[PDB]
Scaffold this active site. Structure first.
Site, mmCIF file in Angstrom:
data_model
loop_
_atom_site.group_PDB
_atom_site.id
_atom_site.type_symbol
_atom_site.label_atom_id
_atom_site.label_comp_id
_atom_site.label_asym_id
_atom_site.label_seq_id
_atom_site.Cartn_x
_atom_site.Cartn_y
_atom_site.Cartn_z
ATOM 1 N N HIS A 169 0.804 -1.223 0.000
ATOM 2 C CA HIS A 169 0.000 0.000 0.000
ATOM 3 C C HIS A 169 0.847 1.288 0.000
ATOM 4 C CE1 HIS A 169 0.150 1.184 4.277
ATOM 5 N NE2 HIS A 169 0.021 -0.108 4.599
ATOM 6 N N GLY A 171 2.354 6.070 10.444
ATOM 7 C CA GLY A 171 3.773 6.012 10.097
ATOM 8 C C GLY A 171 4.454 4.718 10.521
ATOM 9 N N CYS A 198 3.473 1.619 9.703
ATOM 10 C CA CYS A 198 3.344 0.582 8.667
ATOM 11 C C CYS A 198 4.726 0.055 8.206
ATOM 12 C CB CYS A 198 2.512 1.081 7.489
ATOM 13 S SG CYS A 198 0.775 1.450 7.889
HETATM 14 C C1 LIG Z 1 -7.029 3.866 11.692
HETATM 15 N N1 LIG Z 1 -6.674 4.017 10.292
HETATM 16 C C2 LIG Z 1 -7.334 4.831 9.474
HETATM 17 O O1 LIG Z 1 -8.296 5.496 9.844
HETATM 18 C C3 LIG Z 1 -6.851 4.906 8.034
HETATM 19 N N2 LIG Z 1 -6.088 3.774 7.537
HETATM 20 C C4 LIG Z 1 -4.724 4.108 7.121
HETATM 21 C C5 LIG Z 1 -3.837 2.863 7.170
HETATM 22 C C6 LIG Z 1 -3.648 2.428 8.625
HETATM 23 O O2 LIG Z 1 -4.480 1.747 9.219
HETATM 24 N N3 LIG Z 1 -2.550 2.932 9.226
HETATM 25 C C7 LIG Z 1 -2.215 2.861 10.595
HETATM 26 C C8 LIG Z 1 -1.509 1.810 11.175
HETATM 27 N N4 LIG Z 1 -1.278 1.669 12.489
HETATM 28 C C9 LIG Z 1 -1.745 2.606 13.300
HETATM 29 C C10 LIG Z 1 -2.477 3.739 12.867
HETATM 30 C C11 LIG Z 1 -2.976 4.726 13.754
HETATM 31 C C12 LIG Z 1 -3.667 5.802 13.275
HETATM 32 C C13 LIG Z 1 -3.897 5.947 11.913
HETATM 33 C C14 LIG Z 1 -3.439 5.015 11.025
HETATM 34 C C15 LIG Z 1 -2.716 3.878 11.469
HETATM 35 C C16 LIG Z 1 -4.515 1.729 6.432
HETATM 36 C C17 LIG Z 1 -3.756 0.737 5.810
HETATM 37 C C18 LIG Z 1 -4.391 -0.315 5.179
HETATM 38 CL CL1 LIG Z 1 -3.427 -1.561 4.439
HETATM 39 C C19 LIG Z 1 -5.761 -0.418 5.142
HETATM 40 C C20 LIG Z 1 -6.523 0.564 5.746
HETATM 41 C C21 LIG Z 1 -5.911 1.650 6.375
HETATM 42 C C22 LIG Z 1 -6.748 2.687 7.007
HETATM 43 O O3 LIG Z 1 -7.952 2.551 7.110
#
Ligand SMILES: CNC(=O)CN1C[C@@H](C(=O)Nc2cncc3ccccc23)c2cc(Cl)ccc2C1=O
Ligand SMILES: CNC(=O)CN1C[C@@H](C(=O)Nc2cncc3ccccc23)c2cc(Cl)ccc2C1=O
Ligand SMILES: [Cl-]
EC number: 3.4.19.12
Lengths: 298, 305
Positions: A41, A136, A138
């Protein structure tokens, strides 16, 4: 004496963390030999269509203060593999292994290719991990160490609405029914890892905590009926066999300890604690208890 | 999201861990530049431990009586001196893996990461706090002496603890890297006990702010308190007194959440009175005191949920 949530020493993994940037997305990568592994991603979905439009120079890989030159790229499931022109001189002995729910691992949380912390955790029966990650993180990885070999088992991809985390093995296959997109996804109802609670009860006995021990035993079937009622995972004969060494070390048969667990489940703790906890802890495997109560080094 | 007991990455410290042997005793040492630091009790036998005269035991030693092993390489000792309860062994090779470092003495309530080692080999890493009674609730077995505690803020390692002993209650005592013990302990196998321990109040408050940042507010109430009334209550629950320093230190978390420190104190007073009623705070059924105001700011988001 003492019992802590202990992680493996992270040094062998720290020497592999790099920063990967593609357009406006920046995340972490794992640099092993001449390949950098990271969540696909980073190019964000139709991943083949997004990927075909990219050239090697579109990917910026930074290792410390040095820029690595990308000379190739390919996709394996939900992981992007960036071929670079320099083999990592700090590459440890390693394997990619897929873990099962209930198994534990250490996580090296990173931001911008820089490790910030290390913590221990378990793959929940619902395939999520209760991690501690911010935006950040990921590409941060999970691992275990056996002698000098690092077994990479997890790469972080996302956070679910309940604040729990989902990711893949290092071959890009997700743990759990998750997909790598911002769609409606939720963690299934979780259960307690029974073999791990039993292991931690043995650890409490080894450390001098026996108030919960009783004269009773139980059958495996009767214990399983009681475990089903409190959202505990079923206990199998394999779990009993795995707990054999701890049973011989303390003189408490596994089914004898199961009767203690049944009484804690039906009556609570009564204002008491076990190893400084008021909850029944399920993130230490039988092997973790043996390792910490023996002093295995790496 | 999430909140874990997080340790600093241990790599910079792993590259400094060596094994130090004196006769039949083997323990861990910290190799920084051309000096290896280790507990001075490496020169003792189990018998010597009751009333050891370290100056008399040390004068009988030569450089070649100390064996220092770094990985599979033997380091040559070319000098030795004692500084308080630490032995400093001058070696002929500077550690090429020496990170940027400082020696810092910490106060009770401060947290740090521990790299537990046996035979100069790191086995695990965990986070912990210097208790108000100057002990640490570590996880150490025989052979762990010389294991170190540290913080890594920025790229500099601040070494704050070296492990020396386990007390009868299973808790641990040690020194700073200048060999000064934390607490009224001595490096003798004499009758020694940890004083009655207390809860680190400023840390519990910080962790309540962390729960609010992560989206949980069930424990708040409509009351406030004076600082004196809070201390009269909390000391009945074996909680450390909260000082004006602690109130000042909690300022940033108070501004980030909109909850005044004395309003968070009122919530703590009520939590002590009522317990959790089947509820948890950040996945815990007890009030957690091993996260400082600085740890909460480092691990939590700057944006409250
Ligand atoms: C809570 N996340 C979101 O609202 C947006 N989001 C962005 C991204 C994701 O989860 N990153 C994050 C990873 N770990 C902690 C996070 C804490 C806060 C924000 C983002 C975090 C993501 C990656 C994939 Cl592969 C699929 C979906 C998403 C996604 O939905
Ligand atoms: C529990 N201790 C003992 O039975 C013997 N003992 C040996 C030694 C000591 O505590 N080492 C240990 C350190 N950390 C964890 C330990 C777990 C188990 C055993 C030994 C441990 C020691 C050092 C000093 Cl400076 C002063 C006293 C002693 C001492 O009393
Ligand atoms: Cl301090």
């Amino acid at each position: 004496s003492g019992f802590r949530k202990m992680a493996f020493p992270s040094g062998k993994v720290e020497g592999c963390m790099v920063q990967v940037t593609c357009g406006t997305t920046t995340l972490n990568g794992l640099w092993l030999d001449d390949v950098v592994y990271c969540p696909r991603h980073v190019i964000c979905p139709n991943y083949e269509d997004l990927l075909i439009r990219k050239s090697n120079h579109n990917f910026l890989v930074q290792a410390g203060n040095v820029q690595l030159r990308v000379i190739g790229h390919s996709m394996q499931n939900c992981v992007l593999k960036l071929k670079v022109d320099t083999a990592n001189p700090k590459t440890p002995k390693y394997k990619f292994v897929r873990i099962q729910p209930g198994q534990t691992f250490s996580v090296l949380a990173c931001y911008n290719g820089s490790p910030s912390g290390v913590y221990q955790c378990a793959m929940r029966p619902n395939f999520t991990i209760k991690g501690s990650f911010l935006n950040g993180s990921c590409g941060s990885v999970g691992f275990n160490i056996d002698y000098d070999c690092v077994s990479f088992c997890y790469m972080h991809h996302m956070e679910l609405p309940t604040g729990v985390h989902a990711g893949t093995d290092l071959e890009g296959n997700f743990y759990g029914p998750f997909v790598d997109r911002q769609t409606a996804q939720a963690a299934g109802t979780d259960t307690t890892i029974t073999v791990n609670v039993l292991a931690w009860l043995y650890a409490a006995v080894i450390n001098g905590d026996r108030w919960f021990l009783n004269r009773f035993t139980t059958t495996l079937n009767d214990f399983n009926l009681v475990a089903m009622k409190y959202n505990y995972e079923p206990l199998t004969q394999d779990h009993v066999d795995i707990l054999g060494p701890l049973s011989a070390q303390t003189g408490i048969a596994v089914l004898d300890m199961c009767a203690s667990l049944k009484e804690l489940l039906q009556n609570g703790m009564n204002g008491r604690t076990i190893l400084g906890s008021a909850l029944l802890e399920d993130e230490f495997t039988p092997f973790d208890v043996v390792r910490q109560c023996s002093g295995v080094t790496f």
